[PDB]
Amino acid sequence: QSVKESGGRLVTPGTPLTLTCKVSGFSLSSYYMNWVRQAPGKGLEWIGIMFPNGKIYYATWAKGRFTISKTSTTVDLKIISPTTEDTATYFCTGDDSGDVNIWGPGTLVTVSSASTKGPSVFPLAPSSKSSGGTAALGCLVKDYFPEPVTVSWNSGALTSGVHTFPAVLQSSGLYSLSSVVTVPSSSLGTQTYICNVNHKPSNTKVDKKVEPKS
Amino acid sequence: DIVLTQTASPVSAAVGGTVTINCQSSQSVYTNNRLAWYQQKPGQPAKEMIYGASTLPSGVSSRFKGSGSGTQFALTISDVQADDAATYYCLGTYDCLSADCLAFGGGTKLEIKRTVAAPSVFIFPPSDEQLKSGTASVVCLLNNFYPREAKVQWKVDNALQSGNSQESVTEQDSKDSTYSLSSTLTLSKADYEKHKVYACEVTHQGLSSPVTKSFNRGE
């Protein structure tokens, strides 16, 4: 009934890496297990499968580049010799040949020779040039690597009005993204607005308060 | 080298309407009936909409109908809702002893059509925090517009900027079917301090003339 991938990290070209998928509520010998990846902005590609038997089959393009294996509690995918064409989110799925089809949330593998870099967080301050009970404010999280960055507001109490945009790759080879929220104008002095930024690949975790302007 | 070719994206419909997405397989699937359809909302994983060409899982609406056989299949969504906005992939099964067991189609995005909405526009100067490090990011935000086509023009001291901005657009909102966009112009602290008038000018179908939001540095 549940599946989860882990293991996806930044990794230099050529050094191997194994992702793992831990089942919850069924037995490996009982489902079909597949690995599927999705490069950013592109589509789902199928890597290979493990039958309930224990037979294992690979897509032709994948033959020689991955190992699929199991160990009692989990299903494993090893990327034998990562190139930059291998960076993607990797997905674990479970299928009982009938009514259950199960997907993990996915795990991000980044291949590059670049170095982890934590982000810097700056405020997008509510201004007069930011309507009438419609005040816009936000955070800019700039120059991080690799992905990903999560962003919440007021530790999760603010959900409405929030747009967190996709990250863009800058010229420097580092990502930058913003998150903004619309909010009543009658609120700017009373209520406090704080964006909670977390960039786990560098154990950065800053909470910035976004106050108006002088 | 198995390839499945889907309908070109996007594929559009208004709420209440009807869409067909077609899948053509380069060779017949297993027992001419083993073809499934998956729904992927952005950032989420995929959900099984249809399997075995036409079998509808539990908890998938009967608004989704699979059909076809051999090398030609189709998924048809009726009484479309705004949360149907997603990308739909077909997945073909073949004989593991003579070809790849599975193969995915290129995917087809479904875009929900709604009335034309002009963006609300805001502009943000750089923070003093960021200035104290050598670079200056000016950000302007277009909020809740339809359709996604919008052009942003950056102008400093009235000179059109080219090459020094980047932009991002959200995914279509599953309730209101609109889009949002943020543009970021990046200058050096020196260049930012040299000039005065910072303006973001927006052109969109829902506006006859372009709209301009600007600030004057240090006011």
Author numbering:
A (entry chain B): 1 to 130, 132 to 215
B (entry chain A): 0 to 218
Give excerpts from the publication.
We applied a rabbit immune phage strategy to discover four mAbs that selectively recognize peptides bearing an N-terminal diglycine-motif, but not the branched diglycine-remnant generated by trypsin digestion of ubiquitin conjugated lysines (K-ε-GG).
To gain insight into the exquisite selectivity for linear diglycine-containing peptides, we determined the x-ray crystal structure of the 1C7 Fab bound to a GGM peptide at 2.85 Å resolution. There are two Fab-GGM complexes in the asymmetric unit, with well-defined electron density for the GGM peptide that binds in a pocket at the interface of the heavy chain (HC) and light chain (LC) CDRs. Close inspection of the Fab-peptide complex reveals a series of hydrogen bonds that facilitate recognition of the diglycine portion of the peptide. The sidechains of HC Asp95 and LC Glu46 make five hydrogen bonds with the backbone of the diglycine, including with the amino terminus and the two amides. The negative charge of the two carboxylates neutralizes the positive charge of the amino terminus, which is surrounded by the Fab residues and excluded from the solvent. The closest contact made with the methionine sidechain is a 3.1 Å hydrogen bond between the sulfur atom and HC Thr93. This analysis indicates a loosely packed pocket with both hydrophobic and hydrophilic character, which enables the recognition of a broad set of amino acids. Lack of recognition of Trp, Lys, Tyr, and Arg is readily explained by steric clashes with multiple sidechains that line this pocket.
